[PDB]
A paper describes a structure:
Bacteria of the genera Alcaligenes and Pseudomonas are known to perform heterotrophic nitrification, which produces nitrite from ammonia using pyruvate oxime (PO) as an intermediate metabolite. PODs have additional sequences at the N-terminus consisting of 20–30 amino acid residues that are not present in class II aldolases, corresponding to the disordered region of AfPOD in its crystal structure.
The structure of AfPOD and its homologous enzyme BWPOD were very similar to those of class II aldolases, whereas the zinc ion, which is the active center in other class II aldolases, was replaced by Fe(II) ion in the active state of AfPOD. Molecular phylogenetic analysis has shown that these proteins form a monophyletic group that is distinct from other class II aldolases such as FucA, and recombinant experiments have confirmed their POD activity. Initially, we expected the flexibility of the region to cause disorder in the N-terminal sequence of AfPOD and BWPOD crystals, but the AlphaFold2 prediction gave an α-helix conformation in the sequence.
Residue numbers in the entry:
A (entry chain A), B (entry chain A), C (entry chain A), D (entry chain A): 28 to 93, 96 to 250
Write the structure that this text describes.
């Protein structure tokens, strides 16, 4: 499977799991060329993405292979800060945006939430509509070494070492948000023990489990 | 794209996003002739609307081109009060009606809610089943210059300068209501800063963003 | 449209609007012969109902035209107490059952809830699994002259003067329950004024509005 | 109907009712050979299960008929402790996992919840990612003679005397969790009387009702 069809599959999986709110959905894949990234072109939604819809652009959004969503220009900043990351996803999914609107960080209280235990930062500042510089610097510093970040009053972003892991973390974060919001009906949520959480975090992020789960999602589109 | 197929597309987008509760859904488009508007004929739902289902009627609901939903007669009153508005949508969508049933105005707490920041009025009075005169005057005075209004114990109405902007505001209001209701689980909601909210309000209501998002929704029907 | 296809259409509308929880769904239509009713045969769900699946049975569940769901035997008791009623629906729909599980009567707080204003009784007693005699007598006395009743720890039942009105009330009750439950997030719900509620109750239950809305739902199946 | 197609049908019913969260879904059927069980092979989701996808494995996960999901190895432990049980289901369904994340046992407050009255244990300890020995022993001791168990911070498991009853209990538990969570909006939930609950528990778990409801679900896939 080439990276262009893996990118298109990830977009279908994101829409299949209900992670699209207009054209806010963004996905990128680190290009072999420095200061460049592969992303979805402007005006296209997640579930209508084909391999021929992802284009390579540079730091100035010059489509150097194959017009990209200009709100993805900040992706190069976090790519710069994290060489281990090859793919990024940022959407305004319903449950994750509700958590972000209430300024609520994730509370790891169930097994499927552990992939984000000690791996989901929280950026309390909502900068409005900043330039790619301010937005890119703000998220990079707040993301740190973590695999995901909840952006208050905004949504989330996932930083995966592959398109598969970024999609994996993206689907699990949104369902983690739904789970946390529903469990809130019984009052404040008690988190699980950190030692077991990290243990479950490591088991659920295994490349064999991540790869097989992604393949399962592909066959569903 | 002609206005008749844009009207039919808007109805499909409204039903696609779950904004129909029986035959309560109403949509209108200002006619070139004064004291006349284009609307959907009686008995038809949103997702079964075709370009040949929208008819022109006057102040007395006389179908002067192509029987209209008589509960849309009040649309001419707000058209009279706002010459900048060319399209109107009024539905009893599930999340917006729940917000209206609880007498709850919108609290702008997330980025996708900003299109309604300082642009969503609240009519606390529910007049029951008034004549088109009383209902038209009540909503016009309460709507003011705003792009939308929550009608307590009823639903909402959007006033757009085009069918595309009315549909745009309609979809974002309903998902704003869903977001606010879900975020309420954590207690009262803290709104975002007004200066950034207006800034995000202006960016998200850009005609290029509104037009592209509408096109994306059309390709989905 | 014959009554056999109207019964089958009502079942599809009930399943279309998500009102099935296993084989608990029951629908009946008063037969021309006394002490007899038309109902759906045992083992069939709502969305697989055809006109040839409704059979006439008597007080002893003897299929005298065309084996019926024996839990519908109590329908004859309420038919006896209300000669104006020709159709009955009883389901364990998700939102209405949640309201019944919490022993919560309907609070009319939105326009689409008015068809049940002063028309939805509440039976606080859950009798378990009673015989058709006890269950039939208990519901008849508690239903009174009302068009619907919430059965605590159970579900609801609608009593319509036609299959169309029973389906109409059934769909609006379930969405009334969903609306009330969601609006509860903001605290206790303030009901609308009774005078306007009865006025809206009378407008929304007009046979022309009920008939047109039913036709719209049929074209959707 | 052979047991291989009954197993495949159960998986489709589980996915039809929304009981899949990645590849966490597990189903097993006791084999005629001791210390062996029939389960779904690794990497496959519930709704893509065919009769030719279930394989027989022993205590060491050696596929002795037809590679199985190794997280199902603990199924043999509970099979050992309960000879009356022939089928087991363990999923991380959304509503049941939210209940488990909040450490909330089921409160029987509605008729369709009674199949689990005095039949749903609660394991407060979440062991993380234990070996099949620890996980198998922990669940067996906590399950006892009950037909289901809520696993805190995890999900649930159902122990049925057939694939049909395990699927039956599985679907009703998840909808019981959804019902309880939604009813929580009105405050703490008052449970029904135990005598009637056990009576309704016995009526709803009748093999004729369980078998007919399973057949209805099969015709829906
Ligand atoms: Ni964004
Ligand atoms: Ni209205
Ligand atoms: Ni019942
Ligand atoms: Ni598990």
């Amino acid at each position: 499977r080439s990276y262009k069809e893996t990118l298109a599959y990830a977009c279908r999986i994101l829409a299949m799991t209900g992670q699209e709110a207009g054209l806010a959905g963004q996905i990128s894949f680190r290009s072999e060329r420095p200061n460049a990234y592969w992303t979805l072109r402007f005006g296209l939604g997640f579930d209508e993405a084909t391999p021929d819809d992802f284009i390579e652009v540079d730091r100035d959004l010059n489509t150097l292979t194959g017009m990209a969503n200009p709100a993805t220009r900040f992706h190069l900043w976090v790519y710069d800060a994290r060489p281990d990351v090859k793919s990024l996803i940022h959407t305004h999914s319903p449950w994750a945006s509700a958590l972000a609107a209430a300024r609520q960080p994730l509370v790891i209280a169930q097994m499927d939430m552990t992939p984000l235990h000690d791996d989901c930062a929280f950026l309390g500042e909502w900068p409005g509509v900043p330039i790619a510089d301010q937005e890119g610097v703000l998220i990079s510093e707040a993301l740190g070494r973590k695999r995901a970040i909840i952006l208050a009053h905004h949504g989330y972003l996932t930083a995966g070492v592959s398109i598969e892991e970024a999609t994996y973390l993206s689907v699990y974060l949104e369902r983690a948000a739904r789970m946390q919001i529903r469990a809130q009906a019984f009052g404040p949520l008690t988190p699980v023990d950190d030692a077991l959480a990290k243990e479950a975090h490591d088991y659920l992020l295994k490349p064999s489990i991540v790869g097989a789960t992604f393949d399962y999602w592909c066959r569903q589109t």
